[PDB]
């Protein structure tokens, strides 16, 4: 494999061209007055999106040297998305700013490694100052404001999310689905999320979403691991005879049973799935007993009144109206369990919470009550066609992620003002040498980029807006949608602290390492 | 000749691309921190220049649609240069701004002709306000400051020009020549500028400067026109026999004599030139008598003691050490006339100034005294090589032109602040309709361009500098060379009013007419 | 004429590539261990040379942007050659160093004009320090040492030049010619150099050297100007009738006579030339009388015993064995004048030197004695073929020019040590701002280039040699030919001060102006 080698400024310029192209494509979507990007799809209608990471992931370049910068910025956006779930456009613009400033400061006497160290020191100081200024969320109005801001100023989505978190709790289960009407609807459904993924990816039955989903399924629970093929065969014969899907929730499934399940599913078409049992020891027994009561089934392998797997009957299995499964977790909602068994269990767990005073028992009994009683919220997104539903689904997912972040940690001022107000924190640093000073100044200049980008997307000169913001009192910021300087907290323009710090950390960490390159090696394009 | 036709936005975009290229090339030279442009020459060393019109005249484009915009901007710069002699970069940047703003405002319902009318109305109001704020020049220190500012901050050139205008008067003759040493020298030489060009371009004896220049020449003066070939032949025989050049200053020279002079010069190589007599009637007789006394010659064709041209002798002609001639004017400096004749004529004119009290006689007698006594100032530009001498000669010419303008009219604040302070004058206008309002707003936005360009060339953000200037008191401006906000008049950063108003008027007049185009027709390139 | 425009770093890099190519070609010839360059000629054998300006003038590049830098360096070398006649390689390497250092220091906040000002200030300080350290030449041994050093270590050329200047004086006439034997010969010939060029270039009779040269010519002298065609015709009839060339030395020749001389020379083939008379007034009469006595002729146009041109006879003209003429000057050597007339004149001028005590008369009478008695030295260069003769002629011309410079002004240490010892002079400067400091540091780093280049051509590491030189006493330098650190003055490694200061001034003046460019405009290559 013959390769091509470039040195210094030429390679830096090509990589900066790639970075600039990707960041210019991403940046047009930022703020309340941002616009959308249309992405061609090979299998049907094009996609319309305002999400930064979605735009970033779809840009590959033909030139080998520009594609390296494009890939590094894609890594920045993807890391931000997997960590916080929001704020990928901010991370992209910060990364471009840091890369450009670092490239412009490389000379014969400069040491880019020390510049990187200074950049990291400045970012750590800024993050500490951000954590100092954070304040917690205490009222549903703040939740609605956060959700409205994250949903691009849509008040209905914020109200729906606030109502959902009021009904199922701030730490409840919330799901987003395609609707079949023109308006949005929230429904609460009883059910459990047991914090367990599938045993095998072969049970997936869809191309979109990467999930295993079944309807009107049988419930099989085993306290012990499944080993014998004749132990599992009669459950598969039962699931086949009723045409119903089957869910297996056992401590584990061995290679021979998993191979038999996968082969029977692939060849015959039985809708069977196996997943790991929730809990450990007594917590595992308790989860199996409670979920079986909610589904009207039995728990196999128990020591008291033992029921074997080899003689399983249709009435020994439970029933569930819908199931959703993924690699990380699974949910069973509308079980057919008798009300008297659920109420008995609920009352027993309510008594047990009062019997002993310890954190572990109290937490586990509260978790069992929450799983049996609170259920899940499902949000259906309305619209006229698939494209609008897909765009609104992106916005709703962003809003839910940001609201969860703002519940975990506090909130700060929105519109990029939180990073502007942390600029004075860099005046307390004493660099060890000139290169660390250069890195600190790079970060100091970078800290203004998000507000300037938001102002530029609104059609005004961002430099004047930022200058006027820095000259005002600490609670005053710029309302880009209205075009006025207002009190940010009173108007509800607020951001989660976690999103801001995650974006800053990821962008700095990747861009400062990028700016240390001297030689680039790429493969020669073939025919 | 087959042609190509384009309509609307495509043609506008191509012409704007040409305008943008030319103006981007020109704009890098603006201000105390501007840089230079290197232009390839076909016959030798490349030219290095900081002059805006020189850069503009050297850019021709291959694309037919971009070259139209380039040519129109070249017309703007050339008109500004021929009118004021300075301020061509400002005119170019103003023209680009007006063209871009006008192109961005063209729609289906817009009427560009009314937009042009509004632009012209706003420019007229701004020019009137500028004339209101002008103040005259009264001290040599102001002259030195103006010359120093126009010479790109070179104090020595300003001091030399101030000394020259002190020695020969504010309305005296000043010339720029190539020096042969490393330093600049001022020398004062007796002589006359008689406000009369050559009779024929065939007498030019150089490829650089487009002038006729001779040394140790004979002087021939005729009160009447020259007609007979035998009247002029004995003077040509005298000029030939001594190998000396000959200058003819007569009321006129006919076709046969001019043809004979041109043919004899072209074939034999006699250094002969003919020019029109200065003055009218008695003023013509007086100029011939005085200049003959300064050169020791006679005046032919006079009624008292008449001397004929047909019997001319060597001692009937005067002598002059150097002569310079062009299409517009000519100068004879170091004449051989006896001191006693000059002093007698000077004393007679000094007496005649006291004899009668009238403007016409007093003005003409003072002009005769000035021509006989003040002479001319010659500045020689020093340097190591031709390129540096050529660049410094450009700067000295700019400084002299600006100083003459600031003597004719007043001065205003420099650095683009004079146009900034005339922005409020546009708030007193009441447009007749919406298109005139659009034109007024175009001019209002344009009035900020020169200061922003000067600030950008200095490495700072021009928007913040302009915003801070507009918020300060009327006498405060930005010193780009020092980087401080200072009192402009005290620091000597001042401009002539004529240059500013000329640049604004030319730029507006051409760009507003450019922005009215809908169809462009060009010739198809050939092979 | 369509043109191409480039901005900033790209244009700078292309121009630096051109500069680097030309300077790398030139630099290989520097020092006692430098090598030669072979240049293809279109009309015959290739040229072999060690002269820097000859190599520089022969390099034109196809790329339009590299050719600009090449042309600017050619201008540097040509200016140095026309000013000093030696030291063009040093000027070229200094110019490349300054250009590279200036290009590496251009950034957004830098002001190249102030950097140029700092460069010029540093160069002025260095030149003043050089003039302080100069010492005059007092002994013939120093003359021989200077000539030997300038002739690339050839002792025979130095001895010949020293003998020539001993025989004709330090300010006598010396000429270089092609020899016809294997060895070099000096011959002293009586004759005069009268400091007058030809009247017309049409008298040139050779393709090589650009000179008019005649043998066994007639001498025509006129005190007054020649006018009548019948006044000059009988001299042309005499010159024709004897087939001899004719020299005309008169106050001037008119257009009709010059046209007649040129036409008769071009059509018939008469070897006639006309030149201006030497001296003014009485000095002109004296030069004509003395040179006529040395040639046995008469002076026409005199008031005492007047001889007319119209009746000229063969015995009224003088005779001269050889004549050399150029645009600047002319020489008549072996005249046929009788010894008794020369001796009479000589004694009369020797008496007149004692009669009155004044500078003007004493100087003019000493000049007349020197012209009548000292003559000229002719050096013939020996060799086997034309190429070797041409190379040795280049070296001899360099040696003569350097010896004349070292007679006019003093001498300094050779080998680049004189510029090294002026580095501390830059520590007494206080720059006004940071850009002037940058320029001063550029000059400080540049001042080491000549010694490093000389050491590199000798096959050793120049950095260590320069470092060891700077740590030694002021009289110690590096002998590149021997490879030892020696006392430079005792070993005779010395340079003229004028050559060093001229090279430094020219290189700085052009390169610092080059480093201020931001835009480059070139013509698009045609087909
Ligand atoms: N009315 C407003 N005025 C000013 N700033 C606002 C306003 N509304 C939202 N913002 C700010 O705009 C930013 C939201 O940008 P946006 O949602 O387009 O991108 P992001 O969070 O960087 O990433 P992603 O593409 O993943 O959503 C936040 O900083 C938010 O505080
Ligand atoms: N120290 C300074 N600070 C601020 N502005 C300055 C300073 N010195 C000069 N100026 C301004 O810079 C401008 C001079 O620009 P410049 O001479 O480069 O171009 P120009 O006059 O438009 O045209 P041209 O190319 O014909 O000279 C004037 O407006 C002058 O007032
Ligand atoms: N033996 C030596 N040791 C050290 N330096 C020497 C020695 N001989 C000569 N030099 C130095 O070498 C330089 C002579 O270089 P050279 O004659 O090749 O080029 P130049 O003078 O720059 O230009 P040109 O090509 O016009 O002659 C001088 O600085 C001289 O002092
Ligand atoms: K976005
Ligand atoms: K300019
Ligand atoms: K050399
Ligand atoms: Mg968002
Ligand atoms: Mg100017
Ligand atoms: Mg030499």
Curated annotation (Swiss-Prot), chains A, B, C:
GO terms for biological process: 'de novo' protein folding; apoptotic mitochondrial changes; B cell activation; B cell proliferation; biological process involved in interaction with symbiont; cellular response to interleukin-7; chaperone-mediated protein complex assembly; isotype switching to IgG isotypes. Keywords: Acetylation, ATP-binding, Chaperone, Disease variant, Hereditary spastic paraplegia, Host-virus interaction, Isomerase, Isopeptide bond, Leukodystrophy, Mitochondrion, Neurodegeneration, Nucleotide-binding, Phosphoprotein, Transit peptide, Ubl conjugation. GO terms for molecular function: apolipoprotein A-I binding; apolipoprotein binding; ATP binding; ATP hydrolysis activity; ATP-dependent protein folding chaperone; cysteine-type endopeptidase activator activity; DNA replication origin binding; double-stranded RNA binding. The keyword Oxidoreductase does not apply. The modification N6-acetyllysine is found at residues 50, 57, 62, 66, 100, 105, 108, 131, 166, 177, 180, 193, 211, 224-225, 244, 267, 289, 327, 334, 364, 371, 444, 456. The keyword Iron-sulfur does not apply. The modification N6-malonyllysine is found at residue 108. It is an enzyme of class 5 (isomerase). The modification N6-succinyllysine is found at residues 6, 57, 100, 108, 166, 177, 180, 193, 211, 225, 276, 327, 371, 456. ATP binds at residues 50, 86-90, 415, 495. One of its GO terms (cellular component) is migrasome. It is found in: Mitochondrion matrix. The modification Phosphoserine is found at residues 42, 45, 385, 463. The modification Phosphotyrosine is found at residue 65. Its EC number is 5.6.1.7. Pfam families: Cpn60_TCP1. There is a cross-link at residue 526 (Glycyl lysine isopeptide (Lys-Gly) (interchain with G-Cter in SUMO2)). CDD domains: GroEL. Its main location: mitochondrion. It catalyses: ATP + H2O + a folded polypeptide = ADP + phosphate + an unfolded polypeptide. Belongs to the chaperonin (HSP60) family. It is linked to Spastic paraplegia 13, autosomal dominant: A form of spastic paraplegia, a neurodegenerative disorder characterized by a slow, gradual, progressive weakness and spasticity of the lower limbs. Rate of progression and the severity of symptoms are quite variable. Initial symptoms may include difficulty with balance, weakness and stiffness in the legs, muscle spasms, and dragging the toes when walking. In some forms of the disorder, bladder symptoms (such as incontinence) may appear, or the weakness and stiffness may spread to other parts of the body. Homoheptamer arranged in a ring structure. The functional units of these chaperonins consist of heptameric rings of the large subunit Hsp60, which function as a back-to-back double ring. Interacts with 2 heptameric Hsp10 rings to form the symmetrical football complex. Interacts with HRAS. Interacts with ATAD3A. Interacts with ETFBKMT and EEF1AKMT3. Interacts with MFHAS1. Chaperonin implicated in mitochondrial protein import and macromolecular assembly. Together with Hsp10, facilitates the correct folding of imported proteins. May also prevent misfolding and promote the refolding and proper assembly of unfolded polypeptides generated under stress conditions in the mitochondrial matrix. The functional units of these chaperonins consist of heptameric rings of the large subunit Hsp60, which function as a back-to-back double ring. This is 60 kDa heat shock protein, mitochondrial. The gene is HSPD1.
